[PDB]
């Protein structure tokens, strides 16, 4: 059948991605259902009592000094969704748009948003269907705009996307997915248009993708060592202990496991060798590898620690209530007004992860540059070509493409530093977290393409070095190459590699080598 995630208070990143990707169905646990019913009742009381609350009795933003009569709240909230729907640009992909819906749902599930049962049910239905709302990616300063567009979609006044990205009009979407048109009669519109749902959704997808790419980065570094007689002593646990960064210790341990059983790497500790007068001279190779191999634990490790921080922060954000206003469950006050919608946390972690991804992509790019260079690849053919040299150039084009992809990644920096006072100076500081998460996503995609090129190069190098039978190659190394060869043929003669690179990249983002 299909796994089910029961949402109560906390959901981890893997469960979140399982629901967003449609791998798991979602159910609201009874305790959460009750907390929400209780919050729904508080919203009703707040409205009946005519309490001064943003979005219920006031205009929006700087126009909040304009109070609104109870009789016009339906109109007020309907116009809110209208004026905020100014988004432009390509729509968020299927999984990401759904991840945004999930983020809003989790926040509501805490029971401080006043969302009605019907409203919550509409979100749950969307997540359990095979559809996703079609929402423009640009417009928010960090996430009312994309969420307003989502509202329109859920009402059948906006497009939906199937798993392939093909768009369906509103009516067809509600029909196909058996979704009921969203009804905001309870005046709970602010429960849907609020918080950091978009950036959080984009970021959770980024987190999942990086985990997989990180695994490939490790696996490919290990296979590279098997193709270039890499020295395993640089990956010793003893070194990790002397500089105990968790990410590094982990990267080194994972690299050691990848080459376990290999007869292609050099496992001797050079310091065990005692030299005598006859040894003093110039040896063919230095006693240690170039950094792209020797410093892999340190480079990958730093990236892993950045991702770990990103995920710790994101886990808190995903399970938080980023709504404004909010209705305290304890009933201490009718409502609280603040700025929990300021997505500075996801903005800063996304920018940091973006830098880490660019750094790791650089490592992979240099690994390709070393492996394909006849002067540095220790005996392998130039650009790993087969057939007569000259007539054939092998991966010579693909190698430059990897560099071009990396150079492009470097052209874009952090989004967070570009805050600009807007909304008549009322939003004098903005997070730009949604843009930050999206820019990181792009780099992640480029990284997957660079890794794909490295994987194809390594599959070829492994066969050139060890023969088609991959003699001496580790069990893990053999399985990886064999799996790649199931869909990607050896490069016996020059052929277009663009489509294959794109196809493999898509795979790397969703599955790890195991």
Ligand X SMILES: O=C(O)/C=C/c1ccc(O)cc1
Q: Tell me if residue 133 falls in helix, strand or coil.
A: strand
Do residues 378 and 324 touch, judged by C-beta distance below 8 A?
no
The answer for 139, left when phi > 0, alpha when psi is -120 to 50, beta otherwise, is: left
Report which of 318, 411, 405, 304 is spatially closest to residue 352, judged by C-alpha positions.
304
Nearer to ligand X, 425 or 514 (CB): 425
79 binds ligand X (CB under 6 A): no
Q: Least separation, in Å, of the C-beta of 400 and ligand X?
A: 4
Selected range binding its own copies among 208-216, 462-470, 478-486, 500-508, rule: CB under 8 A: 500-508
Counting contacts by CB under 6 A, is residue 427 touching ligand X? Answer: yes
Angle between helices 94-109 and 117-128 (to 10 degrees): 150
Q: Is 41 in the site for its own copies (CB under 8 A)?
A: no
Distance CA 6, CA 507 (A): 29
Q: Which stretch binds its own copies (CB under 8 A): 44-52, 96-104, 170-178, 253-261?
A: 44-52
Q: 468 and 229 in contact (C-beta within 8 Å)?
A: no
397 interacts with ligand X by CB under 6 A: yes
- Residue 24 or 252: which CB sits closer to ligand X? 252
Backbone angles phi, psi at 229, to 5 degrees: 50, 45
Taking residue 189's Cβ as centre, other Cβ atoms within 10 Å add up to 23
Sign of the dihedral defined by the CA atoms of residues 433, 439, 441, 444, in that order = negative
Q: Which two tokens stand for residue 118?
A: 């019907």
Binding flag, residue 421, ligand X (CB under 6 A): no
| CB-nearer residue toward ligand X: 180 or 288 | 288
Binding mask 217-236 for its own copies (x = CB under 8 A): --------------x-xxxx
Determine, following the binding rule CB under 6 A, whether residue 60 of this chain makes contact with ligand X: yes
Binding of residue 396 to ligand X (CB under 6 A): yes
Q: Coil, strand, or helix at residue 122?
A: helix
Which segment (70-78, 234-242, 421-429, 500-508) binds ligand X by CB under 6 A?
421-429
> Up-side HSE of residue 421: CA atoms within 13 Å toward CB?
4
Instruction: Give the shortest CB-415-to-its own copies separation in angstroms.
Output: 5
Task: List the one residue from 180, 468, 493, 512 that touches its own copies (CB under 8 A).
Answer: 493
Contact between 493 and ligand X (CB under 6 A)? no
DSSP code of residue 181: P
Contact with its own copies (CB under 8 A) among 200, 358, 460, 474:
358
Contacts of 189 (CB under 8 A, 6+ apart): 55, 77, 78, 80, 81, 151
Using the rule CB under 8 A, give the single segment among 118-126, 205-213, 365-373, 472-480 that binds its own copies. Answer: 365-373
DSSP H or E segment with residue 301:
helix 296-318
Residue 500 CB contacts under 8 Å (≥ 6 apart), including other chains: 456, 488
Q: How far is the CB of 479 from ligand X (least distance, A)?
A: 31
Residues 162-221 that bind its own copies (CB under 8 A): none
Task: Pick from 459, 505, 508, 509 the residue near its own copies by CB under 8 A.
Answer: 505
CB 176 within 8 A of CB 266: no
> What's the token pair of residue 287?
């006693």
| Binding status of residue 403 toward ligand X by CB under 6 A | no
Residue 406 interacting entry, from its own copies, ligand X, none, C-beta within 5 to 8 Å by type: its own copies
Among 144, 213, 252, 402, binds ligand X (CB under 6 A): 144
Instruction: Give CA–CA dist 84/12, Å, rounded.
Output: 31
Question: Which of 23, 165, 338, 489 is close enough to bind its own copies by CB under 8 A?
Answer: 338
- Structure tokens that stand for 463 in this block: 């066969």
Alpha helix stretches (DSSP H) within 228-245: 237-242
400 lines the binding site for ligand X (CB under 6 A): yes
Q: Which of residues 46-85 bind its own copies (CB under 8 A)?
A: 46, 49-54, 57-69, 72, 75-76, 79-80, 82-85
Distance, in Å, from the CA atom of 328 to the CA atom of 330, rounded to the nearest integer, reads: 5
**Closest distance between its own copies and the C-beta of residue 7, in Å?**
17
**Helices 94-109 and 30-48, interaxial angle, to 10°?**
70
Q: Specify the residue, 4 or 404, whose C-beta has the smaller distance to its own copies.
A: 404
Backbone angles phi, psi at 28, to 5 degrees: -85, 125
Distance of CA 288 to the CA centre of its chain: 35
Question: Could you confirm whether 54 is annotated as catalytic?
Answer: yes
Write down the catalytic residue from 25, 27, 38, 54. 54
Q: Please choose which of ligand X, its own copies, none residue 494 contacts, taking the beta carbon within 5 to 8 angstroms, the exact cut-off set by kind.
A: its own copies
Positive or negative: CA dihedral 275, 277, 282, 283: negative
Give me the residues paired with residue 427 across strands: 422
Two tokens, residue 59: 């205009």
Q: Based on the shown chain and the rule CB under 8 A, indicate whether residue 379 belongs to the binding site for its own copies.
A: no
- Residue 86 within binding range of its own copies, rule CB under 8 A: yes
- Which residues in 282-301 contact ligand X (CB under 6 A)? 288
Residue 426 Cβ vs ligand X, minimum distance, rounded to whole Å: 5
Q: Which is nearer to its own copies, 15 or 140 (CB)?
A: 140
From the list 5, 326, 384, 455, which residue makes contact with its own copies (rule: CB under 8 A)? Answer: 326
- What are the φ and ψ backbone dihedral angles of 360, each rounded to 5 degrees? -65, -35
Residue positions annotated with a catalytic role: 54
Which residues in this chain contact ligand X in the complex, by CB under 6 A?
60-61, 84, 144, 288, 396-397, 400, 423, 426-427
């Amino acid at each position: 059948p299909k796994p089910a995630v029961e949402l109560d208070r906390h959901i981890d990143l893997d469960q979140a991605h399982a629901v967003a990707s449609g791998g798991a169905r979602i159910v609201l646990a009874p305790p959460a259902r009750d907390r929400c019913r209780a919050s729904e009742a508080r919203l009703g009381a707040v409205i009946r009592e005519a309490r001064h609350v943003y979005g219920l009795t006031t205009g929006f933003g700087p126009l909040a000094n304009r109070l609104i009569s109870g009789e016009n709240v339906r109109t007020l909230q309907a116009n809110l969704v209208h004026f905020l729907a100014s988004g432009v640009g390509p729509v968020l992909d299927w999984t990401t748009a759904r991840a945004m819906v999930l983020a809003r749902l989790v926040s509501i599930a805490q029971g401080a948003s006043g969302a009605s049962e019907g409203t919550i049910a509409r979100l749950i239905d969307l997540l359990n269907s095979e559809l996703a709302p079609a929402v423009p990616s640009r417009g928010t300063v960090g996430d009312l705009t994309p969420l307003a567009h989502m509202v329109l979609c859920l009402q059948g006044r906006g497009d939906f996307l199937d798993r392939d990205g093909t768009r369906l009009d509103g009516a067809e979407g509600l029909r196909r997915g058996r979704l009921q048109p969203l009804d905001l009669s309870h005046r709970d519109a602010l429960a849907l248009v609020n918080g950091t749902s978009a950036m959080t959704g984009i970021a959770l997808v980024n987190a999942h993708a990086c985990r997989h790419l990180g695994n490939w980065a490790v696996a490919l570094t290990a296979l590279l060592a098997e193709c270039l007689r890499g020295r395993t002593e640089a990956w010793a646990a003893a070194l990790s202990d002397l500089r105990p960064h968790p990410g590094q210790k982990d990267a080194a341990a994972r690299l050691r496991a990848r080459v376990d059983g290999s007869a292609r790497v050099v496992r001797h500790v050079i310091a065990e060798r005692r030299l005598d007068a006859g040894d003093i001279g110039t040896e063919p190779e230095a006693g240690q590898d170039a950094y792209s191999l020797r410093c892999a634990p340190q480079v990958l490790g730093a990236g892993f620690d950045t991702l770990a921080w990103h995920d710790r922060v994101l886990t808190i954000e995903l399970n938080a209530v980023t709504d404004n206003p909010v209705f305290p469950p304890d009933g201490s006050v009718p409502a609280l007004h603040g700025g929990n919608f300021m997505g500075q946390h996801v903005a800063l972690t996304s920018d940091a992860l973006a830098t880490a991804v660019t750094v790791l992509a650089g490592l992979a790019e240099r690994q390709i540059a070393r492996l394909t260079d006849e002067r540095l690849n220790r005996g392998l053919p130039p650009f790993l070509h087969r057939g007569p040299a000259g007539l054939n150039s092998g991966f010579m084009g693909a190698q430059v493409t990897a560099t071009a992809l990396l150079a492009e990644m470097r052209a874009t920096g952090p989004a967070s530093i570009h805050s600009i006072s807007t909304n008549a100076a009322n939003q004098d500081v903005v997070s730009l977290g949604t843009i930050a998460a999206r820019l990181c996503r792009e780099k992640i995609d480029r990284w997957a393409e660079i890794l794909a090129i490295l994987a194809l190069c390594l599959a070829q190098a492994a066969e050139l070095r060890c023969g088609s039978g991959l003699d001496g190659v580790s069990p893990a190394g053999k399985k990886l190459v064999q799996a790649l060869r199931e869909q990607f043929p050896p490069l016996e003669t020059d052929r277009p590699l663009g489509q294959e690179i794109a196809a493999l990249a898509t795979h790397l983002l969703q599955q790890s080598p195991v």
